[model samples]
Target: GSHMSITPPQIVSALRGRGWKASIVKASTMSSELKRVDPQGILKCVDGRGSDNTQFGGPKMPGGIYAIAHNRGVTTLEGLKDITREVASKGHVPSVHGDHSSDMLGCGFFKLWLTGRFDDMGYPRPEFDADQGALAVRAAGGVIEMHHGSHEEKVVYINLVSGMTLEPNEHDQRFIVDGWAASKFGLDVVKFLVAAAATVEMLGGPKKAKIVIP
Candidate 1:
């Protein structure tokens, strides 16, 4: 397991820990509505109507849901393939982050489960972070739709911000997991899930972050 939660800084630490190198470009965006909701600016990406947008999937556009072109930049069979490769490059195994061995498939107790996608590193955030943080009970349904504050249950969701067509299937999860993976390098994975898609307000770094990436 990784020594830290997959927050902004841990990704940096992971690179150093695993002898990889990383460089970051702060791609940021904002919602006009954001300034009203959080004039003090505590809201994250995908949170409010203002400043909440997605990073382009292909090339790194600061606003809107996709800047890069993967899976035809659409959600389809081939699209899943694109999700896998693009997500894996960031240091995450997009498929196996969570598996409810006892739950029924399509049941809300699942996370993204793609075929042969578990080979990537399972994000090593603490159970508390999963249950209470990203993968919390509220977030069980999928990456999107985790209500603002512990809705429906004590658990909060592991929200993957909106992109083309993130569904309940493992396919959409590939993109979501990839976002989680990048978050280690100070990306705002959560804000996106909350619909505050593109913003620089990333999760706080690891306690003792080591510059793992180059």
Candidate 2:
């Protein structure tokens, strides 16, 4: 398998060379994608405290429910609908933590639905609002949580059950370049920074934020 590897020092120096203040922050834990069919069962199996006295599941799902559906061989819209209905019927919520992008639905109808281009583009208009996709899931008694930024932008933090909050320590404040995605896409430090900076600028990040590459 082909892989790209770069040390943290190399990444920080590259950012500094480009006149952007950058540094490394040691994370208490690594981040990764989380997928589960029975979230409740999984929570019960873990010992850590989670939202509302439950076990804290790691970071929420970083991709759409289609990833789970795809795992179960439910790729088409009709297949997804059937699975969703089945899950709801069983008193379970079909939750999605982020946008659809890893599968066919993501690049097709889901994209159109998000951008409000269905009718003009000759596709059937989705029943849900462009900004409130969660409503559709909620209406079906399912869970839906949207990501705050690009899928690659991530944070490491401690989870607290009190009001269900994510508390980032000093080490968690730095901007992090996800090396996994970077290496997978063959992006060097310079290219990664270019993409990251664009996202930061779009989100109006703080000027003095430190950057971490790990």
Whose TM-score is greatest here?
2
* Best-matching candidate per lDDT: 2
User: Model 1 lDDT vs. the true structure?
Assistant: 0.24
Q: Summarize candidate 1's per-residue lDDT along 3-37 as a digit string, tens digits.
A: 12345454444444533333332222212101111
RMSD in Å for all candidates: 17.7, 11.6
Candidate 2 residue runs with Cα over 4 Å from true position? 1-4, 17-19, 27-57, 60-143, 146-194, 207-214
Residue-level lDDT of model 2, residues 1-214, one tens digit each, is 1234545566556556655565554332323322222434111101111112222322221123322342233334455455445545532345543333332222222443345432443333444442344344445455543322222223322121111222112323433223332232232434333434433433444323243222
Q: Estimate each model's TM-score.
A: 0.23, 0.34
Judged by whole-model lDDT over C-alpha atoms, candidate 2 comes out at 0.34
Quote the positional error of residue 89 for candidate 2 in Å.
Answer: 21
lDDT of each: 0.24, 0.34
